[PDB]
Amino acid sequence: GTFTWTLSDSEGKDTPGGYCLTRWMLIEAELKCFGNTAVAKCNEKHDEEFCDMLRLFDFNKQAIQRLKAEAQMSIQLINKAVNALINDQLIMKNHLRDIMGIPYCNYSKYWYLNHTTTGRTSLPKCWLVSNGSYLNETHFSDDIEQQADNMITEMLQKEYMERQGKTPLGLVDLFVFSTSFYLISIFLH
Amino acid sequence: GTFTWTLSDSEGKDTPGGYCLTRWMLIEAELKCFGNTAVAKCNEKHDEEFCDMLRLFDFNKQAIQRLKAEAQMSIQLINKAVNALINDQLIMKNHLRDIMGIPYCNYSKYWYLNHTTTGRTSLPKCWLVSNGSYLNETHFSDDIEQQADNMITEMLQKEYMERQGKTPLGLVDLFVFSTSFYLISIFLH
Amino acid sequence: GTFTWTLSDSEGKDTPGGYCLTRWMLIEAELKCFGNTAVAKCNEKHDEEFCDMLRLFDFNKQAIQRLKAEAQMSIQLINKAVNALINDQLIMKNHLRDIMGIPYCNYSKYWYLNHTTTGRTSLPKCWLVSNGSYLNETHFSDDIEQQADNMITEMLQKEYMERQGKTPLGLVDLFVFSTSFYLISIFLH
Amino acid sequence: GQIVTFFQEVPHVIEEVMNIVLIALSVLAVLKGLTSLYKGVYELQTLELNMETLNMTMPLSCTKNNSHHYIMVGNETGLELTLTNTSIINHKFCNLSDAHKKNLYDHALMSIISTFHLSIPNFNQYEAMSCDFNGGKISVQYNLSHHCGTVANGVLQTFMRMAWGGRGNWDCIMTSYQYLIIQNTTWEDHCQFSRPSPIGYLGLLSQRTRDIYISRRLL
Amino acid sequence: GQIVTFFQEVPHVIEEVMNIVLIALSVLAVLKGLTSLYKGVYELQTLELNMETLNMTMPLSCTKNNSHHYIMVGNETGLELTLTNTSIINHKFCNLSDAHKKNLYDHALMSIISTFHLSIPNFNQYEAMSCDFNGGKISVQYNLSHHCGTVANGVLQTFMRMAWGGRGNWDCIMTSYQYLIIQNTTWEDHCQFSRPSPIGYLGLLSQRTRDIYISRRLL
Amino acid sequence: GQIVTFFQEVPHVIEEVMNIVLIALSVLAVLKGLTSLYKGVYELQTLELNMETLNMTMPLSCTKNNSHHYIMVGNETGLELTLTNTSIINHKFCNLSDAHKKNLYDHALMSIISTFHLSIPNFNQYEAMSCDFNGGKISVQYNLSHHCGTVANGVLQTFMRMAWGGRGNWDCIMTSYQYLIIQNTTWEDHCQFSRPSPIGYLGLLSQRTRDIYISRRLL
Ligand SMILES: O=C(O)[C@H]1O[C@@H](O[C@@H]2[C@@H](O)[C@@H](O)OC[C@H]2O)[C@H](O)[C@@H](O[C@H]2OC[C@@H](O)[C@H](O)[C@H]2O)[C@@H]1O
Ligand SMILES: O=C(O)[C@H]1O[C@@H](O[C@@H]2[C@@H](O)[C@@H](O)OC[C@H]2O)[C@H](O)[C@@H](O[C@H]2OC[C@@H](O)[C@H](O)[C@H]2O)[C@@H]1O
Ligand SMILES: O=C(O)[C@H]1O[C@@H](O[C@@H]2[C@@H](O)[C@@H](O)OC[C@H]2O)[C@H](O)[C@@H](O[C@H]2OC[C@@H](O)[C@H](O)[C@H]2O)[C@@H]1O
Ligand SMILES: *[C@@H]1O[C@H](CO)[C@@H](O[C@@H]2O[C@H](CO)[C@@H](O)[C@H](O)[C@H]2NC(C)=O)[C@H](O)[C@H]1NC(C)=O
Ligand SMILES: *[C@@H]1O[C@H](CO)[C@@H](O[C@@H]2O[C@H](CO)[C@@H](O)[C@H](O)[C@H]2NC(C)=O)[C@H](O)[C@H]1NC(C)=O
Ligand SMILES: *[C@@H]1O[C@H](CO)[C@@H](O[C@@H]2O[C@H](CO)[C@@H](O)[C@H](O)[C@H]2NC(C)=O)[C@H](O)[C@H]1NC(C)=O
Ligand SMILES: *[C@@H]1O[C@H](CO)[C@@H](O[C@@H]2O[C@H](CO)[C@@H](O)[C@H](O)[C@H]2NC(C)=O)[C@H](O)[C@H]1NC(C)=O
Ligand SMILES: *[C@@H]1O[C@H](CO)[C@@H](O[C@@H]2O[C@H](CO)[C@@H](O)[C@H](O)[C@H]2NC(C)=O)[C@H](O)[C@H]1NC(C)=O
Ligand SMILES: *[C@@H]1O[C@H](CO)[C@@H](O[C@@H]2O[C@H](CO)[C@@H](O)[C@H](O)[C@H]2NC(C)=O)[C@H](O)[C@H]1NC(C)=O
Ligand SMILES: *[C@@H]1O[C@H](CO)[C@@H](O[C@@H]2O[C@H](CO)[C@@H](O)[C@H](O)[C@H]2NC(C)=O)[C@H](O)[C@H]1NC(C)=O
Ligand SMILES: *[C@@H]1O[C@H](CO)[C@@H](O[C@@H]2O[C@H](CO)[C@@H](O)[C@H](O)[C@H]2NC(C)=O)[C@H](O)[C@H]1NC(C)=O
Ligand SMILES: *[C@@H]1O[C@H](CO)[C@@H](O[C@@H]2O[C@H](CO)[C@@H](O)[C@H](O)[C@H]2NC(C)=O)[C@H](O)[C@H]1NC(C)=O
Ligand SMILES: *[C@@H]1O[C@H](CO)[C@@H](O)[C@H](O)[C@H]1NC(C)=O
Ligand SMILES: *[C@@H]1O[C@H](CO)[C@@H](O)[C@H](O)[C@H]1NC(C)=O
Ligand SMILES: *[C@@H]1O[C@H](CO)[C@@H](O)[C@H](O)[C@H]1NC(C)=O
Ligand SMILES: *[C@@H]1O[C@H](CO)[C@@H](O)[C@H](O)[C@H]1NC(C)=O
Ligand SMILES: *[C@@H]1O[C@H](CO)[C@@H](O)[C@H](O)[C@H]1NC(C)=O
Ligand SMILES: *[C@@H]1O[C@H](CO)[C@@H](O)[C@H](O)[C@H]1NC(C)=O
Ligand SMILES: *[C@@H]1O[C@H](CO)[C@@H](O)[C@H](O)[C@H]1NC(C)=O
Ligand SMILES: *[C@@H]1O[C@H](CO)[C@@H](O)[C@H](O)[C@H]1NC(C)=O
Ligand SMILES: *[C@@H]1O[C@H](CO)[C@@H](O)[C@H](O)[C@H]1NC(C)=O
Ligand SMILES: *[C@@H]1O[C@H](CO)[C@@H](O)[C@H](O)[C@H]1NC(C)=O
Ligand SMILES: *[C@@H]1O[C@H](CO)[C@@H](O)[C@H](O)[C@H]1NC(C)=O
Ligand SMILES: *[C@@H]1O[C@H](CO)[C@@H](O)[C@H](O)[C@H]1NC(C)=O
Ligand SMILES: *[C@@H]1O[C@H](CO)[C@@H](O)[C@H](O)[C@H]1NC(C)=O
Ligand SMILES: *[C@@H]1O[C@H](CO)[C@@H](O)[C@H](O)[C@H]1NC(C)=O
Ligand SMILES: *[C@@H]1O[C@H](CO)[C@@H](O)[C@H](O)[C@H]1NC(C)=O
């Protein structure tokens, strides 16, 4: 099967439905909020690693707030829900990339393109590690520009999908027919 | 992996390609027909429970009509095809919701928004059960309105996708260019 | 989980990002190039067989070029990556179709609609085999026309998605508002 | 051209009203030149799936009084799942290989109990489980004797994985019932409390062998 | 601006014809102011994938006369799968732990047969299977002796899971052949009947251990 | 109506410039009638996830000097993973069923090592593994003695499946270290080299029992 876990509501005013990472989650970086789009991106995607991690974060938060810690581990929940939280073969793909000798995902550092003015973010993706060191930002600069273009395309697409969802086709149809018939009237004039 | 089973053709005049549930399937409610859209909705979705059930229904129907009952069970087919019929971790998600103490799926009652005039239906989704009883319709009224809005958006989107599939971009392009050039001609006039 | 393997860059001038099959791959048919669209089609699809095969092809190519053959088999890679390369229950679906007695996928011959003038291809799909023989092209002619229509719709849709990705809504909006306000000015005139 | 139905449903959004206004202006100009009801029509009609229609391929789970759970396979055989203080079995055996030697049992029931036993999370105490298979009868008893981290916890977990019918916290569950009984029975309609459903067994098939402990290096 | 190719393919739909008409009207007004062939061009060109190109990573399945099935791993070793009335083995053993003790065999072949034996649906009779591994040779024989619900049913099921080459009904299959033989062999082109393919083994990997019976509580 | 932000990002495409030109023409006509910076604003801000926040539910893997690997479960217990030439264990036993008999150990650690041992690809030599569980302590040693196709290959494979910290080719890996040690320890911050992460164990859970050899027909 695939993952089925859903993200708990997050108490972020700017981002109502998107998992916001608190001070404790991010090392020496205070609190950052991502938004509903970035976290909901991988409700169909099986090839992203960071949103699986934040699903792990939300599962931990649920297990703490709505159960009792008891000071001893309950591996039952994680062993049962691991296939419901994360993809099962993405780690296999990164293990294979590692064996072959191409840069693989670290799973500790993740990089994202924070939009300075508006504060949107791409869904963070793994910082490739190779040869026992971090890849220079120059090495995968091409991937950085590809992700920037992906952000642009995805935000310009989601608004289209929202417009399609709210606006029926009978409107844009009867609009183009009416404008065409008025253009015909101008032709007659 | 994921499910791969496909729905057998259903002998419903109103709904040619959509699984129609007969009298026997629905307790004390005669026969209802859903349509191709509702049943085909979860050809990409992994988070719906009722269409997995109707895939089970169609698998049973195929096993009865195109094999022999023999009066003794053949668990081989169901044990082989269970991963090809239903999602494998959605039941895990509902077990977890049950353990935590939030309302979980019953898997017996399913509710849907029957459009009275046209007869369309949303894909039925599980009636949440909690605290040893059915949730009041008031409790998840918000989810009901969310599903109504989802029906509206999905029907206003599918017609757009059909128009995109049948109408090429060279048409809407050469149309907007021609209308713009005629507007330029009116500017010259 | 699902598949996560990605297709290695292919040295085809016509098709930069699409897996091109060389002379050795295709029996007595020289070299053919498919394109990025056909190979990328099943990055969300779980119901196609041929692109799983070409993922197997690319995995073999990677294992040969970037490891050492050593003349003895390394089943470790394939046993680890099989869930990352192919769907796990599509073969189950074809086994079931075989048991029931409907035509099933052979997994040797695949048919596709080569566009003669432009050279595009649909993603090849399995030639159904039944009753110990190949089905006549007349028998599944309906499926052939359905796939032709699917090619037409998918190519007319992908260009729409590309236009949506590159063109923002603020343009088409301010365009329709400006044209409407000019039509209002013509009404005043 | 079915805008009429949609228009009543969602005229609130500004873009729709703007579009309708522009269309009406263009039309006027060209002519001059020439119970549970949602929204307005959507209704909360509900389904009660008769799952007896799957009696020929799938086992169905339903219960009678929150203590007598059942699994029916076919229209001829089923099993009791009774939470009780009384033990029908007083020997700590499970003669599985003897059952396989004398293939006189029903394969469906043995597969049911195999799935049930391979889904018990972190099962490590084999003293609890007891079995009887003489004549093809399926009998399995469990001792729910116990702080948490006990086989009783996981065994109740897999019970409510299967039956889905049911003071414990933090993923630990306790019941006053000391024992549980699984045993063969015929088919009737004796599960007023719960509707029959197959989902318990299909979901239990997912987690089988997932949380198992290693007892041998080779396996 | 590649409308020319699409226009021939699908001009039937009313919306397209309306669009073209409107465009032609606008253009005229502005100028005044100033073998197997489908549709028309699509062809049923077919592919015959040479699966020998996967000889270096994947085992390929192909058969000669509908009774001699084969699995080739690499370009040096393969296995016979023969449905016959003759038994090469007359002892009911499978010395698997002895084979693992003396690691003188080919790992690919042992993994092949392990997958084959872990995909046998509801296997419960161990008397049928017989093995020989002396010297690294892979030999496995099966007794297909038998109404249904027999190990022969599931063993033929997993055969056609693997080979995909082949009067039984209701998910029960019977063959006149009493026995089946799996044994080591070299590589040739001796499978005229069937093209070599890996899909049988990859699919068999899916269902391994899925339908297995419990023989011990701890496992 | 947030076109202003997008316009700076991507004005290169011809269609956008054409649209803007047409809009400006229409507006003019109607008025007459009346560190690491990408693109211009996107920045490569990075995240360093403090995975200690998952100490209450998930085991975290981190290492100190590329030879001392660690797995910490909770904030009280963890395990050493040391590649060394020194053996703490000189007996070829693994008393797993004795450990299950006396349930005095931590369930998390036993599940960790069970997952570790069920993910070893094509494990066939049981002489290598040695275990100590007296008192609830978790000790597992591995002999990495060896051409390839050796248990050392797969055992290093599963090591770097778990720890992800590390001249061998063609999916064969060799190390000068003869032995490896897993043993119980308390919790500190002694893994300067590597950040703690759970991904090794979650990924190892995927491949458990996948590449296992059959040692018995019934299983
Ligand atoms: O644990 C294992 O997987 C193997 O352990 C070997 O040694 C045993 C110890 O584990 C301990 O239980 O004390 C008894 C020892 O025998 C077993 O020898 C080995 O059994 C296989 O080889 C012997 C053969 O007779 C059996 O049929 C095999 O199962 C365990 O696999
Ligand atoms: O079935 C099981 O999983 C355990 O059963 C225990 O009792 C046995 C009975 O099942 C029955 O077979 O009659 C013989 C009994 O021994 C086993 O003792 C237990 O074996 C483990 O503990 C003993 C040890 O010597 C073995 O190495 C373990 O496998 C079964 O797990
Ligand atoms: O391999 C198997 O699955 C069964 O093999 C049967 O025969 C054994 C041979 O495999 C070989 O190891 O030499 C010893 C033989 O016993 C076993 O008898 C059978 O064990 C079951 O039936 C006997 C019972 O005492 C055990 O508890 C069962 O495990 C193997 O399943
Ligand atoms: C089990 O289900 C089957 C069909 O799913 C039921 O079979 C039908 O039973 C009715 C009883 O009046 C007959 O009229 C039909 O002819 C039967 N149809 C088939 C296809 O068998 C069966 O009744 C169910 N079992 C029980 C005990 O009710
Ligand atoms: C079920 O478990 C309970 C407790 O684990 C068993 O009760 C124990 O029985 C032994 C022997 O009869 C006594 O020595 C203990 O003092 C009892 N303990 C308790 C807490 O009652 C009970 O016997 C088990 N059931 C069966 C059938 O063996
Ligand atoms: C399960 O197998 C054991 C194997 O020992 C059976 O125990 C034997 O049962 C017979 C039956 O009367 C007795 O004659 C023997 O003395 C028993 N042996 C021992 C060592 O006690 C056990 O009976 C089987 N289970 C069932 C329910 O029959
Ligand atoms: C197995 O496949 C490999 C490649 O997939 C074949 O190797 C090629 O064989 C031809 C034979 O004429 C040589 O010219 C090439 O140089 C080989 N290429 C590589 C990369 O090895 C091999 O021939 C196949 N096995 C058999 C028996 O045909
Ligand atoms: C394969 O199975 C058949 C039947 O299951 C075995 O034939 C039996 O052999 C025994 C002893 O030789 C006889 O007592 C039976 O009467 C036979 N039954 C039948 C139906 O022929 C056959 O021996 C098995 N093959 C092997 C190699 O043991
Ligand atoms: C599989 O293992 C069994 C273990 O008993 C082997 O049986 C022994 O084989 C040797 C070989 O000559 C004989 O000397 C013994 O007398 C046999 N023991 C018994 C109890 O019969 C068996 O031979 C092995 N299988 C193969 C193919 O060698
Ligand atoms: C393990 O993680 C938990 C929370 O994920 C940490 O618990 C917090 O510890 C700080 C220490 O200053 C306290 O102020 C908080 O009140 C604790 N919160 C909770 C919810 O327990 C814990 O410190 C971590 N373990 C270690 C050893 O640092
Ligand atoms: C780990 O493996 C090595 C080699 O596999 C073992 O070293 C062998 O020990 C035996 C008995 O002490 C000698 O007869 C061999 O000559 C040794 N071989 C080599 C290559 O050194 C070593 O004993 C094993 N470790 C343990 C603890 O048993
Ligand atoms: C694992 O189990 C074996 C079972 O034989 C233990 O071996 C016995 O250990 C005791 C402990 O002193 C000795 O008295 C026996 O003589 C041993 N038996 C044999 C045949 O050697 C072994 O000790 C256990 N492992 C550990 C670490 O205790
Ligand atoms: C992005 O940058 C702004 C300041 O320019 C900051 O306030 C915000 O927290 C950043 N977002 C993230 C996710 O770091
Ligand atoms: C990365 O850049 C640093 C300097 O910034 C340089 O010393 C190092 O060699 C570079 N690494 C690679 C792999 O090019
Ligand atoms: C919806 O209601 C109509 C009558 O208003 C009825 O004919 C139809 O069967 C209903 N559909 C379903 C699925 O119940
Ligand atoms: C549901 O509504 C009924 C009355 O319709 C009321 O008695 C009951 O308490 C309600 N349940 C909850 C959980 O509010
Ligand atoms: C399609 O046909 C053209 C010639 O009409 C040929 O050049 C091309 O290779 C064909 N494509 C495929 C994939 O066979
Ligand atoms: C397929 O066509 C051939 C002739 O082209 C004919 O002989 C054969 O019977 C046909 N097969 C079927 C199943 O109709
Ligand atoms: C069970 O169902 C089958 C198939 O409909 C039927 O033939 C048989 O009589 C039923 N059994 C009983 C006891 O009614
Ligand atoms: C079973 O025993 C418990 C505790 O001994 C007690 O609640 C009662 O005697 C029995 N349980 C019930 C529900 O009657
Ligand atoms: C679903 O609700 C019905 C209402 O009577 C109840 O009988 C049944 O037990 C519920 N399902 C489950 C799994 O509890
Ligand atoms: C098998 O293929 C390898 C790699 O191409 C080659 O070196 C070897 O000679 C082949 N074996 C035979 C028997 O041709
Ligand atoms: C094998 O035996 C069967 C029945 O005894 C019989 O068909 C024949 O002798 C053999 N089978 C074949 C296909 O020759
Ligand atoms: C596919 O068709 C070819 C045609 O000759 C045949 O040889 C082969 O056996 C078929 N594939 C399968 C799996 O039967
Ligand atoms: C571990 O975490 C728990 C929960 O925050 C806390 O109560 C306990 O004191 C911690 N243990 C140590 C040794 O700090
Ligand atoms: C372990 O032994 C090897 C070979 O005997 C040798 O490299 C050295 O003595 C030890 N390894 C290290 C890294 O010191
Ligand atoms: C990720 O990078 C950090 C950088 O210091 C390193 O410590 C850590 O080991 C890396 N992760 C893995 C899994 O190697």
Side-chain angles (χ1 to χ4, degrees), chain A residues 4-173:
Chain A
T4 51
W5 185 275
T6 60
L7 290 180
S8 178
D9 52 307
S10 66
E11 290 303 318
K13 48 178 180 185
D14 59 328
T15 67
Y19 206 55
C20 186
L21 309 193
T22 69
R23 164 166 46 184
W24 280 7
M25 288 185 176
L26 305 156
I27 277 164
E28 298 170 16
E30 301 287 66
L31 176 142
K32 302 152 195 170
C33 278
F34 285 121
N36 65 317
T37 57
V39 298
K41 191 157 285 298
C42 58
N43 282 319
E44 69 276 16
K45 301 296 180 181
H46 297 284
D47 47 20
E48 313 295 343
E49 296 97 335
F50 174 75
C51 68
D52 285 335
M53 297 306 295
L54 62 82
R55 283 195 212 115
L56 298 189
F57 281 163
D58 187 47
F59 173 78
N60 183 70
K61 196 178 69 67
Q62 295 293 54
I64 299 299
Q65 66 182 357
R66 187 175 291 155
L67 276 70
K68 308 185 192 340
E70 193 270 331
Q72 196 163 13
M73 295 298 101
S74 64
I75 51 170
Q76 301 295 12
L77 293 174
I78 182 54
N79 281 47
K80 282 160 30 176
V82 62
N83 299 348
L85 304 170
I86 66 168
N87 189 358
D88 207 51
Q89 309 291 326
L90 192 52
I91 303 173
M92 186 46 60
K93 179 201 69 176
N94 289 310
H95 169 58
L96 295 172
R97 303 214 289 209
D98 191 21
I99 293 198
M100 294 195 315
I102 133 166
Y104 63 108
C105 167
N106 179 314
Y107 275 106
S108 295
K109 216 184 216 180
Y110 298 79
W111 58 266
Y112 67 96
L113 277 298
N114 190 28
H115 191 199
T116 294
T117 79
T118 64
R120 279 75 177 272
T121 62
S122 67
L123 175 70
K125 57 193 55 57
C126 203
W127 188 298
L128 300 168
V129 62
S130 70
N131 208 282
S133 296
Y134 276 23
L135 279 73
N136 280 324
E137 179 252 270
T138 61
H139 274 57
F140 53 86
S141 67
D142 54 286
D143 290 351
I144 309 285
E145 289 108 15
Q146 186 205 352
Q147 296 311 315
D149 280 302
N150 270 20
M151 293 177 70
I152 294 147
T153 53
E154 281 165 347
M155 65 180 107
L156 303 197
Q157 276 165 6
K158 178 180 167 295
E159 301 172 33
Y160 266 122
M161 181 173 282
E162 295 294 328
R163 185 52 65 75
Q164 291 180 358
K166 306 174 181 18
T167 294
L169 279 82
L171 289 176
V172 297
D173 291 331

Side-chain angles (χ1 to χ4, degrees), chain D residues 2 8 20 32-33 46 53 55 69 98 115 123 138-139 141 146 150 167 190 198 200 205 216 218:
Chain D
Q2 309 146 1
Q8 47 96 3
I20 308 174
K32 165 71 67 182
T46 64
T53 197
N55 63 9
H69 295 350
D98 186 2
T115 305
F123 178 85
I138 300 289
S139 294
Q141 170 214 356
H146 279 88
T150 304
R167 298 285 75 78
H190 53 84
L205 275 175
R216 259 174 43 169
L218 265 184

Side-chain angles (χ1 to χ4, degrees), chain C residues 21 24-27 32 34 50 53 56-57 59-60 63-64 72-73 75 78-79 82 86 88 91-92 94-95 99 104-118 124 127 137 141 144-145 149 151-152 155-156 159, chain E residues 2 5-6 8-10 35-39 41-51 53-59 73-75 106-108 111 115 157 160-161 164 166 171 195-199 201-203 205-208:
Chain C
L21 309 193
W24 280 7
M25 288 185 176
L26 305 156
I27 277 164
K32 302 152 195 170
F34 285 122
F50 174 75
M53 297 306 295
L56 298 189
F57 281 163
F59 173 78
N60 183 69
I64 299 299
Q72 196 163 13
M73 295 298 101
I75 51 170
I78 182 54
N79 281 47
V82 62
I86 66 168
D88 207 51
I91 303 173
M92 186 46 60
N94 289 310
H95 169 58
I99 293 198
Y104 63 108
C105 167
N106 179 314
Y107 275 106
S108 295
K109 216 184 216 180
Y110 298 79
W111 58 266
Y112 67 96
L113 277 298
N114 190 27
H115 191 199
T116 294
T117 79
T118 64
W127 188 298
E137 179 252 270
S141 67
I144 309 285
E145 289 108 15
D149 280 302
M151 293 177 70
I152 294 147
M155 65 180 107
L156 303 197
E159 301 172 33
Chain E
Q2 309 146 1
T5 63
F6 319 131
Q8 47 96 3
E9 305 154 5
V10 274
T35 308
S36 298
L37 190 146
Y38 280 90
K39 187 55 67 70
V41 60
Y42 293 94
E43 290 180 356
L44 189 70
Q45 193 170 0
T46 64
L47 300 177
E48 182 66 27
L49 295 175
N50 187 359
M51 302 284 202
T53 197
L54 303 157
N55 63 9
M56 287 298 97
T57 43
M58 296 167 192
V73 58
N75 59 22
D106 196 87
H107 291 35
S111 177
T115 305
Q157 292 214 308
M160 58 177 213
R161 290 287 294 163
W164 284 42
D171 200 8
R195 195 56 63 175
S197 184
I199 292 311
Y201 177 64
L202 294 202
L205 275 175
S206 299
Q207 201 262 337
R208 62 181 294 166

